[PDB]
Amino acid sequence: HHWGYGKHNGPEHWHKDFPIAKGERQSPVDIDTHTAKYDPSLKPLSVSYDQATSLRILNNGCAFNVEFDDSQDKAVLKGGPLDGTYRLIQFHFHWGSLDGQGSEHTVDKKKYAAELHLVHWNTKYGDFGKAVQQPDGLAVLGIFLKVGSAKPGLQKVVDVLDSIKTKGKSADFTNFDPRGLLPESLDYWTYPGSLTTPPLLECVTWIVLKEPISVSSEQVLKFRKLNFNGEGEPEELMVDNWRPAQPLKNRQIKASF
Ligand SMILES: C#Cc1cccc(S(N)(=O)=O)c1
Ligand SMILES: [N-]=[N+]=NCC(=O)NCCS
Ligand SMILES: [N-]=[N+]=NCC(=O)NCCS
Ligand SMILES: [Zn+2]
């Protein structure tokens, strides 16, 4: 694809091919904690990952995706702002070149070192491709990463990155348990938004956890050793693959707490 994160094809250019980039419910956004309002209408959030079936990890040229078997209800998200059942299809991260940037969402303008997106689609629509054409087709659980102590449940991800250094490479990634990437608390913020890469479709219910997970410097350092380029091409480190905050427009961010 033509789009990327560089000066000539980055976020400020995406609107030429994807005019929805200037739409009414774009993501990410800044979460102003002083104007977000507690909502008693929100039901308990249910993250049910016990039967998750991971398959593969892929360097897609922009991030890496850990993919799941979504052919049945094995790992699902329900409750909170959501009606019905949303199946886990993949997760990926966004991160920076330096620890002071990398996240897509910000909190009172604070950028974290990275952001984890656990992507789920609404089973009422039958497949992911149909779900992304619907306003309520996806639910993305966003989790901030800060640099501190190592996250043990991340380490299996870090150690396979060696084998998917360049665009188009993949590796077997079975028997990975995404429960190991979650913080203690499920307190969250929620708002209606979009995919944060082209095609930027306005199909996502965002659920952003308040509590970040800690990862070590060595762990995030390994993320930054990945490449955007394919094998045998000049090296471009895979860093700063985040879209900045977009205008909130006519949206309210609701707090679960
Ligand atoms: C699948 C998936 C997928 C594709 C584009 C962006 C996103 S994101 N970054 O979670 O909004 C997820
Ligand atoms: N695999 N690798 N990345 C290929 C890429 O260009 N995908 C774009 C969707 S057509
Ligand atoms: N080589 N490679 N880099 C070109 C490009 O910008 N890739 C898309 C990253 S999302
Ligand atoms: Zn993402």
From Swiss-Prot:
Changing V140 to F/Y: Strongly impaired activity. Residues 1-257 form the Alpha-carbonic anhydrase domain. Activated by X-ray, histamine, L-adrenaline, L- and D-phenylalanine, L- and D-histidine, L-His-OMe and beta-Ala-His (carnosine). Substrate binds at T196, T197. Changing T196 to D/E: Strongly reduced activity, but enhanced zinc affinity. Changing L195A: Reduced CO(2) hydrase activity. InterPro entries: CA_dom, CA_dom_sf, Carbonic_anhydrase_a-class, Carbonic_anhydrase_a-class_CS. Interacts with SLC4A4. Interaction with SLC4A7 regulates SLC4A7 transporter activity. Interacts with SLC26A6 isoform 4 (via C-terminus cytoplasmic domain). Catalyzes the reversible hydration of carbon dioxide. Can also hydrate cyanamide to urea. Stimulates the chloride-bicarbonate exchange activity of SLC26A6. Essential for bone resorption and osteoclast differentiation. Involved in the regulation of fluid secretion into the anterior chamber of the eye. Contributes to intracellular pH regulation in the duodenal upper villous epithelium during proton-coupled peptide absorption. It is linked to Osteopetrosis, autosomal recessive 3: A rare genetic disease characterized by abnormally dense bone, due to defective resorption of immature bone. Osteopetrosis occurs in two forms: a severe autosomal recessive form occurring in utero, infancy, or childhood, and a benign autosomal dominant form occurring in adolescence or adulthood. Recessive osteopetrosis commonly manifests in early infancy with macrocephaly, feeding difficulties, evolving blindness and deafness, bone marrow failure, severe anemia, and hepatosplenomegaly. Belongs to the alpha-carbonic anhydrase family. This is Carbonic anhydrase 2. The gene is CA2.
